[PDB]
Design a protein around this ligand. Structure first.
Ligand SMILES: Nc1cccc2cc[n+]([C@@H]3O[C@H](COP(=O)(O)OP(=O)(O)OC[C@H]4O[C@@H](n5cnc6c(N)ncnc65)[C@H](O)[C@@H]4O)[C@@H](O)[C@H]3O)cc12
Ligand SMILES: Nc1cccc2cc[n+]([C@@H]3O[C@H](COP(=O)(O)OP(=O)(O)OC[C@H]4O[C@@H](n5cnc6c(N)ncnc65)[C@H](O)[C@@H]4O)[C@@H](O)[C@H]3O)cc12
Ligand SMILES: Nc1cccc2cc[n+]([C@@H]3O[C@H](COP(=O)(O)OP(=O)(O)OC[C@H]4O[C@@H](n5cnc6c(N)ncnc65)[C@H](O)[C@@H]4O)[C@@H](O)[C@H]3O)cc12
Ligand SMILES: Nc1cccc2cc[n+]([C@@H]3O[C@H](COP(=O)(O)OP(=O)(O)OC[C@H]4O[C@@H](n5cnc6c(N)ncnc65)[C@H](O)[C@@H]4O)[C@@H](O)[C@H]3O)cc12
Lengths: 134, 134, 134, 134
């Protein structure tokens, strides 16, 4: 069902991630985003697990807060596991972070071409993503 | 697939290399150029290695910045390795650099005939390259 | 902490890599090897990433099975990313493989001097490595 | 640093070139020889280029196998390039080869005085070289 899963830290919602998800839907991507999918009484574990398993692609918004928190590391551990079984997925974004900070977090992600929010705007990034997914 | 691989420093894009690559495609050469080929989520290592291995020829834009940087030296190591197995490839260009500076970088490249950007224009250089490749 | 990280395919453990790692420790190199470090309940992603980032050197056992598999290519991407930031690391070994097969995998590794297991024995290779590391 | 660079084919190591290089060091010449300088993980291109550029003199062992191979012709290109900038270097040796075979390879080397291994012994040749270098 879903085309893209969005993994992000809650400190980045208002200035970046909410505008991004809203514009991707307007282009026509079917997106998994937590404010759209999770409802009262749902199991967090079981809903996240089935969202990770049923998405064609996943995007990760790398940030200083992303590195520290628990649920963000839970999601990225699951994306790499599915990619090491033969299915390529990960589309990275760099937000307020430099190459050296990424290379100190993991040197394998420093090998992957990312979109940098200090160089591209929100809609300029959204157009780049939809060209791969669609 | 590709006819030519272009190896250059990013400081030289706007005043020389972007005009050159645009005019080569208009003559009909099938060219490997990083702004045309690399996309979000690609592995840099694995895409560059298959570009080097599947091209008939390679051109190197010698420059004061080309000498210092890392990825430029990575690409030239791979071109010489394939040439020392019996397949001639390299077509050199000298940009803002003199014979002495080239001879201090490597005396073997000082033996190979090159196109000098202080003597020829962009389209005059492009016409010279296509006569060898095509 | 670690002096050397060993990257290898699991098909090569018993006739080559297990004897090699055992003899390197006896010479006194502090080595990262998966049978010594990984334990029940560890995250594979997070433990491999910190092993790559905290080692002075890395060795890669090039082999016909190494080229095909997923986790072997994951590790080599991270080594090259750290080397293209200015820190030299890679010490290559050729096992049951010829120059032509290496040049068809990547022409840049064909430029780097390697130890060939058809020419040198296990302890003769181990002595060569420790002279660089120590 | 280096006084002499030795350029030779690997088919000639055991019966001529290893004894020669060992006796030159005993006289006190500082020599560039591949078995003494190159180590695991070195770039072949970048180490050879800095050896050619930092030596006062160069010697070439002309032989039937020398003429055919690739890396032997690579080194002689760089020596002539530096000599055509005004710095005399080349000290030739003829091994199992006649004047006619040299003249068919290049008529300019047939003009330079050479040492012939059918007329002089190893130590008799080594004494002749050191009188020029030292
Ligand atoms: N939508 C969501 C609702 C609830 C929990 C979520 C956890 C994670 N996520 C997923 O993970 C990324 C965010 O990681 P995160 O690390 O930013 O999240 P936090 O841990 O900060 O939690 C955020 C806030 O939920 C409050 N809280 C904690 N347990 C609670 C509970 N049972 N009932 C009510 N409220 C609770 C907690 O008090 C804080 O105010 C996203 O991509 C997303 O897919 C989304 C969540
Ligand atoms: N197109 C390209 C994109 C990304 C990296 C490239 C590296 C090399 N090349 C190849 O090598 C020659 C240029 O050498 P170069 O030495 O000029 O390049 P730089 O190292 O300066 O990198 C240039 C910029 O990429 C930024 N950067 C670094 N890692 C990044 C990452 N994972 N995701 C996003 N951005 C990243 C880095 O912040 C800088 O602003 C060309 O012929 C070409 O074929 C092309 C590249
Ligand atoms: N030590 C190790 C344990 C587990 C997984 C590893 C993966 C990779 N490595 C690293 O990568 C190189 C080897 O690449 P490799 O490609 O040889 O490995 P394989 O994919 O063949 O996995 C080998 C076996 O683990 C079984 N398996 C898969 N997921 C499993 C899981 N969660 N729990 C239990 N067992 C699992 C899988 O069934 C097969 O029998 C080494 O340098 C090393 O640093 C080492 C591993
Ligand atoms: N010391 C040396 C080591 C390696 C390569 C050299 C190349 C050239 N040289 C220089 O050139 C003259 C000799 O020309 P040459 O033409 O005699 O040499 P070959 O091409 O026959 O190579 C000889 C052997 O290296 C094996 N081979 C090829 N690539 C390899 C690689 N990455 N890692 C491991 N082994 C590799 C290849 O399998 C063969 O067995 C000398 O004056 C010297 O300064 C010296 C070399």
């Amino acid at each position: 069902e879903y085309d893209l899963f969005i993994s992000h830290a809650s400190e980045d919602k208002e200035d970046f991630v909410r505008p991004l998800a809203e514009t991707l839907q307007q282009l026509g991507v079917n997106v998994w985003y937590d404010e759209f999918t999770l409802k009262v009484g749902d199991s967090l574990r079981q809903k996240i697990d089935s969202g990770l398993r049923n998405s064609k692609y996943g995007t990760v918004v790398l940030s200083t807060d992303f590195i520290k928190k628990d649920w963000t590391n839970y999601e990225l551990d699951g994306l790499v596991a599915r990619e090491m079984n033969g299915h390529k997925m990960i589309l990275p974004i760099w937000h307020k972070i430099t190459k050296n900070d990424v290379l100190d977090y993991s040197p394998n992600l420093a090998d992957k071409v990312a979109l940098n929010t200090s160089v591209n705007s929100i809609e300029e990034i959204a157009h780049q993503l939809a060209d791969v997914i669609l």
